[PDB]
Amino acid sequence: IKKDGCIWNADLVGIELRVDDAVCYSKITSVEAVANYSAIPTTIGGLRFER
C-alpha cells in the first residue's frame, strides 16, 4: 500500500486517544458490505447472468 501509485482522497482512517494511547479504529468496508451485492448466479430481470 506504499505511495507513488496508490490513491486515496481523505477520511479513510480515524484517530482516537484519551491518555497517550493513540488507538486506531477500522472504517474500511469489505466487498460484502454494500447493498445490491449479488453472486455468480444472478437472475435480475429477464437476463440470467452466468459465468
Partner 1 sequence: STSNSFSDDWAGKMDRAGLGFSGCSDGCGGAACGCFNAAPSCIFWRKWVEN
Shortest separation between residue 8's beta carbon and partner 1, angstroms: 15
14: phi then psi, degrees, rounded to nearest 5: -100, 160
Binders of ligand NAG among 1-51, rule CB under 6 A?
Answer: 35-36
Whole-angstrom distance, CA of residue 48 vs CA of residue 28: 32
Residue placing its CB nearer to ligand NAG in the complex, 9 or 36: 36
Answer yes or no: are the C-beta atoms of 27 and 12 closer than 8 Å.
yes
Grid coordinates representing 1?
Answer: 500500500
The window from 1-9, 11-19, 27-35, 41-49 that contacts partner 1 (CB under 8 A) reads 1-9
Binding interface with ligand NAG (CB under 6 A): 35-36
